[PDB]
Amino acid sequence: AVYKVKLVGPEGEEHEFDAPDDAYILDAAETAGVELPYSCRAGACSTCAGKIESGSVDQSDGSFLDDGQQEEGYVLTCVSYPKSDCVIHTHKEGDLY
Ligand code: FES
């Protein structure tokens, strides 16, 4: 399945694109010409942190966020598979200190 993902940046800018259910959101975003922050690309840091506003993802390949943070809606975009249409706020690394 191919879902629709909308990213909302720190300045209010928006990006909307197709995201295959078998591709990481970060990779789908790059295919769509969006430059997002990232570093390890392995789910082991907080650089690519984003926050789900709606929709759901599978970020089980990640291991940096604890259940609390995940409950609040934080997602590691570099290891997140979309499971439905999503609206995610990017550049949220600052929230994870
Ligand atoms: S870039 Fe490090 S967890 Fe995503």
Q: How was this structure determined?
A: X-ray
Resolution (A): 2.5
Cα 94 from Cα 15, distance rounded (Å): 21
Domain ranges of the chain: 1-97
Structure tokens at 28: 């789908």
Instruction: Tell me which residue of 88, 5, 1 sits closest to 49, measured CA to CA.
Output: 88
In whole angstroms, what is the distance from residue 42 CA to residue 59 CA?
11
Q: Decide if 41 contacts 78 (C-beta within 8 A).
A: yes
Tokens of 34: 């969006």
Q: Is 12 within 8 Å of 24 (Cβ atoms)?
A: no
Q: Which atom of ligand 1 is nearest to the CA of 64?
A: 3
Cβ neighbours, 10 Å, residue 77 = 28
φ, ψ of residue 31 to 5 degrees: the values are -60, -35
| Helix/strand/coil (H/E/C) assignment for every residue in the chain | CEEEEEEECCCCCEEEEEEECCCCHHHHHHHCCCCCCCCCCCCCCCCCEEEEEECCEECCCCCCCCHHHHHCCEEEHHHCEECCCEEEECCCHHHHC
Residues contributing to the annotated binding site: 40, 45, 48, 78
Rounded to whole angstroms, the Cα distance separating 81 from 57 reads 5
Q: How far apart are CA 45 and CA 70, in angstroms?
A: 14
Atom of ligand 1 lying closest to residue 76 CA: 4
> 14 — phi, psi (to 5°)?
-125, 150
39 ligand 1 Cβ < 6 A: yes
In whole angstroms, give the CA distance from residue 33 to residue 36.
10
